[PDB]
Amino acid sequence: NPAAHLTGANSSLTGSGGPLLWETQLGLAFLRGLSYHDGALVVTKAGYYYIYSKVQLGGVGCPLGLASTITHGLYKRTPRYPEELELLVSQQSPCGRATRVWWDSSFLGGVVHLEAGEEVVVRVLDERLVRLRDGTRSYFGAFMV
Amino acid sequence: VNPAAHLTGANSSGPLLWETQLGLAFLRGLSYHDGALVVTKAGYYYIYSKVQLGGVGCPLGLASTITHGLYKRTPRYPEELELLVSQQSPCGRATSSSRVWWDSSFLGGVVHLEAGEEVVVRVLDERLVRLRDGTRSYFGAFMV
Amino acid sequence: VNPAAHLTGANSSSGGPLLWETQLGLAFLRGLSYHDGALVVTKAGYYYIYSKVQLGGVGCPLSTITHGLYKRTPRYPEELELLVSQQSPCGRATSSSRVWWDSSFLGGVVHLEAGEEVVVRVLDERLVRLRDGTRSYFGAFMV
Numbered sequence: 001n002p003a004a005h006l007t008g009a010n011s012s013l014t015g016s017g018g019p020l021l022w023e024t025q026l027g028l029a030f031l032r033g034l035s036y037h038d039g040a041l042v043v044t045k046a047g048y049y050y051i052y053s054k055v056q057l058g059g060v061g062c063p064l065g066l067a068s069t070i071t072h073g074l075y076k077r078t079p080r081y082p083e084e085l086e087l088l089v090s091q092q093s094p095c096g097r098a099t100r101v102w103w104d105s106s107f108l109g110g111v112v113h114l115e116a117g118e119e120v121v122v123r124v125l126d127e128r129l130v131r132l133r134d135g136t137r138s139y140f141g142a143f144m145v
Numbered sequence: 146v147n148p149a150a151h152l153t154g155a156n157s158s159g160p161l162l163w164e165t166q167l168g169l170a171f172l173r174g175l176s177y178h179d180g181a182l183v184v185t186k187a188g189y190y191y192i193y194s195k196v197q198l199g200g201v202g203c204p205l206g207l208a209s210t211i212t213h214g215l216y217k218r219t220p221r222y223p224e225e226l227e228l229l230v231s232q233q234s235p236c237g238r239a240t241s242s243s244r245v246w247w248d249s250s251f252l253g254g255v256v257h258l259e260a261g262e263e264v265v266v267r268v269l270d271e272r273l274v275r276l277r278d279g280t281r282s283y284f285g286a287f288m289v
Numbered sequence: 290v291n292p293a294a295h296l297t298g299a300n301s302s303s304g305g306p307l308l309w310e311t312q313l314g315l316a317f318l319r320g321l322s323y324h325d326g327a328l329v330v331t332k333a334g335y336y337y338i339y340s341k342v343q344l345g346g347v348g349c350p351l352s353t354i355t356h357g358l359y360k361r362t363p364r365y366p367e368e369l370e371l372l373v374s375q376q377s378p379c380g381r382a383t384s385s386s387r388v389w390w391d392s393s394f395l396g397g398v399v400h401l402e403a404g405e406e407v408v409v410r411v412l413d414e415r416l417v418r419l420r421d422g423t424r425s426y427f428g429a430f431m432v
């Protein structure tokens with residue numbers, strides 16, 4: 001019964017170690033049987049959820065004196081615990097086939113068990129370009145299985 | 146009971162055409178019409194599509210992109226809104242000419258769909274899309 | 290209760306289909322069985338099956354990676370293709386010092402009878418990074 005799909009991808013928090021923020025109202029964005037708080041999908045009904053997130057990614061250059069790669073991730077928060085558990089993580093960049101401005105896309109999807117009160121957040125690590133389209137192309141939702 | 150569908154195969158044309166009956170292609174509670182998935186029952190659907198891309202070019206490197214998306218056609222406004230969209234750099238100058246490259250774009254998400262509404266899969270420069278295997282390129286959905 | 294399963298990446302001991310964790314942490318089997326890398330269908334029906342694999346390397350071999358979900362009936366030897374993707378995460382002319390990472394996700398609805406198996410196979414699994422069960426996993430659920 002419960003499900004949700006969010007878009008928006010406010011990247012204002014990522015710099016200071018915060019998760020992405022998402023629209024829950026406008027357009028295809030919706031909450032049904034789930035809650036939302038400060039970028040987190042809050043679970044109301046306990047059980048197995050198929051969680052998913054897609055992140056549209058951009059880059060202005062692709063060199064590696066050291067290394068440039070992006071880390072897309074779905075994480076679990078348990079309110080009484082300081083730790084954000086890695087649930088579904090992808091390490092990604094088309095820089096593997098590079099020698100330039102680029103596009104890439106990260107999809108994460110998986111069935112995880114969630115409890116009432118637990119939250120799920122999306123973090124994108126080391127992003128260097130946010131196009132006007134990134135917020136709406138990127139999305140993050142789930143549905144109870 | 147629950148409506149579900151998985152469309153194998155592929156062909157070129159805007160929208161992409163799909164197989165419906167042959168092989169892993171199936172329709173249960175869902176309809177299909179000329180590159181478009183048609184809904185019978187209203188409700189929330191996890192729709193998905195994977196597109197296999199391949200070529201022997203890519204002069205423009207990572208600047209050469211591929212847009213792959215799911216689009217909903219509605220009568221509330223006779224237009225298509227892009228729902229789930231993926232734009233990727235499928236290759237770069239790292240692959241020489243006369244050398245094959247591959248890439249794959251997956252999309253999946255939950256949208257609300259009324260009865261009679263249609264969803265198509267569209268890809269920028271379908272000249273690169275590789276139809277030949279339906280396991281490599283497919284488009285399906287299922288209600289939540 | 291709706292059958293579901295999520296298997297996490299474990300050290301695969303080139304060696305055939307990938308092996309998975311089924312109990313520890315994010316790994317679980319509910320209504321679904323497991324046997325030597327294969328998810329086993331106990332209750333016939335339609336399943337959304339999914340698999341993600343994390344790929345990474347230094348420089349580049351050759352290099353095209355094939356990531357695929359396959360089906361097999363324990364009576365018959367052949368494994369039928371279900372969901373396959375081909376990627377070229379690196380080029381033969383990329384910097385030999387370039388450390389690259391690319392993820393491959395596959396998801397799709399398939400019909401499965403009772404007793405049938407679903408496996409994940411990757412061409413050059415040496416390029417698969419199974420350090421994290423969060424980076425490489427394989428799950429499914431009945432629709």
Ligand SMILES: *[C@@H]1O[C@H](CO)[C@@H](O)[C@H](O)[C@H]1NC(C)=O
Pocket residue numbers: 010011012021
């Ligand atoms: C991101 O969120 C903060 C707090 O609501 C807001 O000040 C800022 O304008 C937002 N950015 C965008 C583009 O939505």
